[PDB]
Amino acid sequence: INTFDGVADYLQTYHKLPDNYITKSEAQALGWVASKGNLADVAPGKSVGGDIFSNREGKLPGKSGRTWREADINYTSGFRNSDRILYSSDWLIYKTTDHYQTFTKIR
Structure with missing residues (x-):
């Protein structure tokens, strides 16, 4: 599963x-x-995802104790x-299609 809807639903559920x-x-x-662009060579079928996303440009909504994590889509x-x-600890789901420049809420 690596589509916006697919990962969004999976996560919430x-x-x-x-x-x-x-x-x-x-x-x-x-x-x-990373600079060799080889993920699919060393890990076929795999996407990088699950790392904490700091939110410093402060573009996504904050809240006491809320953590944001990210996952790549369409790879x-x-x-x-x-x-x-982008998914918080409390399951708000957002997406970006321009390298975290802008986000749209999807769930």
């Missing part, structure tokens, strides 16, 4: 990202080399694309 996601640290460990192979899903 199962409260974890689907099995095709790995964090950046786990992908680095597995052999992911198949090559260099990571510009699409990301």
Whole structure:
């Protein structure tokens, strides 16, 4: 599952990202080399997702004790694309299609 709707629904319902996601640290460990654009070479079918998103430009809504995490969307192979899903600890879901420049709420 790696589509906006698909990951959005999965998260709200199962409260974890689907099995095709790995964090950046786990992908680095597995052999992911960002400037080589090789994720799909060292980890076919996998997307990076689950890392904490700091929210410093402060574009997404904050709240006492709320954490934001991210996951890449639409990724198949090559260099990571510009699409990301943003999900809080309390399950508000937002998406970005321009490298966190703008966000739209989707759930």
